[PDB]
Design a protein around this ligand. Structure first.
Ligand SMILES: [Mg+2]
Ligand SMILES: [Mg+2]
Ligand code: NA
Length: 100
């Protein structure tokens, strides 16, 4: 076990850097979930096609199956659900995903 959060010399450092702040609390993510959320958020109101999300989050050269995007959208929605934030991630069937 590693201490979740450490304070030393007035510096606060969390074991897991990939957290976002919501309602005075924190949602704890993985790198890939965090990068996916960032992408969608930076592209608010602009629908992102699955292949574009794949390129930006997993890499233009990636050998991963494109449906990994759908998998991680589900993981991210599940992370947002306890904070009633999941509906911000909308599916555009046959295109991709968007935050409005
Ligand atoms: Mg951080
Ligand atoms: Mg943070
Ligand atoms: Na969490």
């Amino acid at each position: 076990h590693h201490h979740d959060i450490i304070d030393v010399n007035g510096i606060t450092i969390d074991k897991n850097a990939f957290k976002v702040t919501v309602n005075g609390a924190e949602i704890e993510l993985t790198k890939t979930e965090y990068d996916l959320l960032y992408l969608l958020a930076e592209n608010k109101n602009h629908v992102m096609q699955r292949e574009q999300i794949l390129n930006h989050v997993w890499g233009y050269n990636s050998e991963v199956e494109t449906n990994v995007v759908d998998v991680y959208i589900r993981y991210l929605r599940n992370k947002l659900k306890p904070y009633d934030r999941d509906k911000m991630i909308e599916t555009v069937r046959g295109v991709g995903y968007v935050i409005r």
